[PDB]
Design an enzyme around this catalytic site. Structure first.
Site, PDB file in Angstrom:
ATOM      1  N   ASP A  63       4.589   8.516  -6.087  1.00 36.76           N
ATOM      2  CA  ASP A  63       4.709   7.058  -6.132  1.00 36.76           C
ATOM      3  C   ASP A  63       5.115   6.656  -7.545  1.00 36.76           C
ATOM      4  O   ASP A  63       4.271   6.523  -8.434  1.00 36.76           O
ATOM      5  CB  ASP A  63       3.402   6.387  -5.730  1.00 36.76           C
ATOM      6  N   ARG A  71       2.554   7.182 -11.410  1.00 36.70           N
ATOM      7  CA  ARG A  71       1.519   8.187 -11.631  1.00 36.70           C
ATOM      8  C   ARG A  71       1.685   8.881 -12.978  1.00 36.70           C
ATOM      9  O   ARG A  71       0.692   9.194 -13.645  1.00 36.70           O
ATOM     10  CB  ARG A  71       1.543   9.216 -10.502  1.00 36.70           C
ATOM     11  N   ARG A 138       4.635  -5.815  -7.693  1.00 38.95           N
ATOM     12  CA  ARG A 138       5.434  -4.707  -7.185  1.00 38.95           C
ATOM     13  C   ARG A 138       6.651  -5.189  -6.409  1.00 38.95           C
ATOM     14  O   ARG A 138       7.570  -4.398  -6.167  1.00 38.95           O
ATOM     15  CB  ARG A 138       4.580  -3.808  -6.291  1.00 38.95           C
ATOM     16  N   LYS A 168       9.754   0.091   1.566  1.00 36.30           N
ATOM     17  CA  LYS A 168       8.425  -0.168   2.104  1.00 36.30           C
ATOM     18  C   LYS A 168       7.963  -1.590   1.774  1.00 36.30           C
ATOM     19  O   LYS A 168       8.485  -2.196   0.839  1.00 36.30           O
ATOM     20  CB  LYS A 168       7.434   0.857   1.549  1.00 36.30           C
ATOM     21  N   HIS A 169       6.996  -2.136   2.515  1.00 37.95           N
ATOM     22  CA  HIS A 169       6.341  -1.491   3.656  1.00 37.95           C
ATOM     23  C   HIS A 169       6.724  -2.198   4.957  1.00 37.95           C
ATOM     24  O   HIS A 169       6.255  -3.296   5.244  1.00 37.95           O
ATOM     25  CB  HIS A 169       4.823  -1.500   3.469  1.00 37.95           C
ATOM     26  N   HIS A 181      -5.589  -0.787   1.881  1.00 36.27           N
ATOM     27  CA  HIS A 181      -6.450   0.291   1.405  1.00 36.27           C
ATOM     28  C   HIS A 181      -7.882   0.115   1.895  1.00 36.27           C
ATOM     29  O   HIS A 181      -8.584   1.107   2.123  1.00 36.27           O
ATOM     30  CB  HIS A 181      -6.450   0.351  -0.125  1.00 36.27           C
ATOM     31  N   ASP A 251       2.470   5.376   6.191  1.00 30.52           N
ATOM     32  CA  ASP A 251       1.625   5.160   5.035  1.00 30.52           C
ATOM     33  C   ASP A 251       0.389   6.052   5.153  1.00 30.52           C
ATOM     34  O   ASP A 251       0.105   6.629   6.209  1.00 30.52           O
ATOM     35  CB  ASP A 251       1.239   3.685   4.906  1.00 30.52           C
TER      36      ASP A 251
HETATM   37  C1  LIG Z   1      -1.822  -1.500   0.330  1.00 31.92           C
HETATM   38  C2  LIG Z   1      -0.327  -1.818   0.366  1.00 31.92           C
HETATM   39  C3  LIG Z   1       0.409  -0.560   0.889  1.00 31.92           C
HETATM   40  C4  LIG Z   1       0.546   0.450  -0.254  1.00 31.92           C
HETATM   41  O1  LIG Z   1       0.513   0.103  -1.415  1.00 31.92           O
HETATM   42  N1  LIG Z   1       0.684   1.737   0.102  1.00 31.92           N
HETATM   43  C5  LIG Z   1       0.817   2.769  -0.904  1.00 31.92           C
HETATM   44  C6  LIG Z   1      -0.298   3.775  -0.780  1.00 31.92           C
HETATM   45  N2  LIG Z   1      -0.110   4.614   0.391  1.00 31.92           N
HETATM   46  C7  LIG Z   1       0.849   5.701   0.242  1.00 31.92           C
HETATM   47  C8  LIG Z   1       1.623   5.930  -1.039  1.00 31.92           C
HETATM   48  O2  LIG Z   1       0.709   6.398  -2.014  1.00 31.92           O
HETATM   49  C9  LIG Z   1       2.375   4.706  -1.544  1.00 31.92           C
HETATM   50  O3  LIG Z   1       3.746   5.002  -1.542  1.00 31.92           O
HETATM   51  C10 LIG Z   1       2.173   3.448  -0.718  1.00 31.92           C
HETATM   52  O4  LIG Z   1       3.160   2.512  -1.114  1.00 31.92           O
END
Ligand SMILES: CCCC(=O)N[C@H]1CNC[C@H](O)[C@@H](O)[C@@H]1O
Length: 339
Positions: A63, A71, A138, A168-169, A181, A251
């Site tokens: 990510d 990261r 974001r 995404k998403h 989350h 996801d």
């Molecule tokens: C809560 C909003 C969705 C969200 O942020 N998802 C992230 C975490 N899941 C999977 C991956 O780590 C990443 O790419 C995703 O974008």
């Protein structure tokens, strides 16, 4: 050996015997990296090398959006801005913003490929409604047309280093309030309303969009299943109405919202049955291993083609060469002055 449908993670900064066992399982197809897997560039290059040594067909992802989702932030990785910063620059100078967006994407991909990583899960195509805190900065912009051309410029920079992309998403996390989350967000708009704005970037990008991650969000007027478990969203809309032929990554099934599918193995089966080509199982490798061994069989030939197409294309410059490359240096100087 061919890639499996499961993307998981490893235990640490060096590969363990348990990692090697999971990486050799037929149903493994990807590794996703997090901050805990990064000590420095040398250690990371060694890690990715050892991963491919076990499974040469493996897809390695991370990510790297910029801003609050990146990261690797140290030992030479450029700290990239939040994508909202590019929408704010767009509001001052459209063309400059598209030039900067490409430079961001090239820096992003080139630095990753120098450590042996295939792809980043970027760009966020969620619209900046202001309704979602977990998305927040974001998001590129409020206007779907601005998101499209900015995301497209970024994907172009990624492509200059041979790296794919992943929007995404889908169909859109920017309107719902809750954080998937921790809870299950809901979006009570009509299908048409969702299609006119939130889905438009996915449609307009065309071939510049290589893959998609669907949101763990329930769009109550379209389907009571979350989009990642919804055949309506993944097949009827994305593959049918939009004709999308790129890869679909679920996801993270570890997220609380994904408990709308049951156990991890059951959620994985539902996501793949719905139209996902791969499923992410993050932050619990042993639980991922249960999914690997319990995953119910399915037709995967169509998925394998799309998974393979996510591997980075061509050769990558190693760090010792990237640091002296004029294009890299030009991108760096532009990103500093423009922002
Ligand atoms: C809560 C909003 C969705 C969200 O942020 N998802 C992230 C975490 N899941 C999977 C991956 O780590 C990443 O790419 C995703 O974008």
């Amino acid at each position: 050996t061919t890639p499996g449908p499961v993307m998981l993670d490893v235990v640490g900064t060096t590969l363990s015997r348990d990692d090697a066992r999971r990486l050799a399982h037929p149903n493994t197809g990807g590794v996703i990296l997090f901050a805990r897997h990064f000590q420095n560039r040398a250690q990371l290059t060694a890690l990715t090398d050892s991963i491919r040594a076990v499974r040469e067909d493996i897809l390695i992802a991370v990510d790297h959006e910029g801003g609050r989702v990146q990261r690797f932030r140290t030992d030479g990785f450029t700290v990239l801005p939040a994508m909202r910063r590019l929408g704010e620059l767009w509001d001052r100078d459209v063309l400059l913003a598209t030039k900067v967006a490409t430079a961001v994407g090239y820096i992003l991909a080139a630095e990753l490929r120098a450590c042996g990583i295939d792809m980043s899960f970027t760009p966020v195509l969620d619209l900046d409604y202001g309704h979602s805190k977990v998305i927040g900065d974001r998001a590129f912009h409020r206007d779907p047309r601005v998101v499209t051309l900015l995301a497209k410029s970024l994907n172009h920079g990624l492509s200059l280093a041979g790296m794919a992309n992943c929007g995404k998403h889908f169909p859109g996390h920017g309107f719902a309030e809750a954080d998937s989350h921790v809870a299950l967000p809901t979006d009570d708009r009509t299908l048409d309303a969702i299609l006119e704005q939130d889905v438009a970037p996915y449609d307009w990008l065309g071939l510049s969009l290589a893959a998609v991650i669907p949101a763990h969000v329930i769009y109550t007027q379209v389907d009571k299943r979350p989009a990642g478990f919804s055949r309506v969203w993944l097949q009827d809309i994305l593959r049918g109405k939009l004709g999308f032929t790129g890869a679909i990554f679920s996801d993270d099934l570890s997220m609380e919202a994904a408990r709308e599918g049951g156990t991890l193995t059951q959620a994985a089966d539902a996501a793949l049955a719905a139209g996902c080509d791969m499923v992410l199982v993050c932050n619990q490798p042993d639980a991922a291993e249960v999914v690997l061994n319990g995953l119910k069989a399915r037709a995967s030939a169509e998925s394998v083609r799309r998974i393979k197409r996510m591997r980075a294309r061509g050769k990558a410059l190693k760090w010792d060469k990237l640091i002296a490359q004029p294009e890299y240096l030009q991108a760096q100087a532009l990103l500093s002055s423009a922002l």
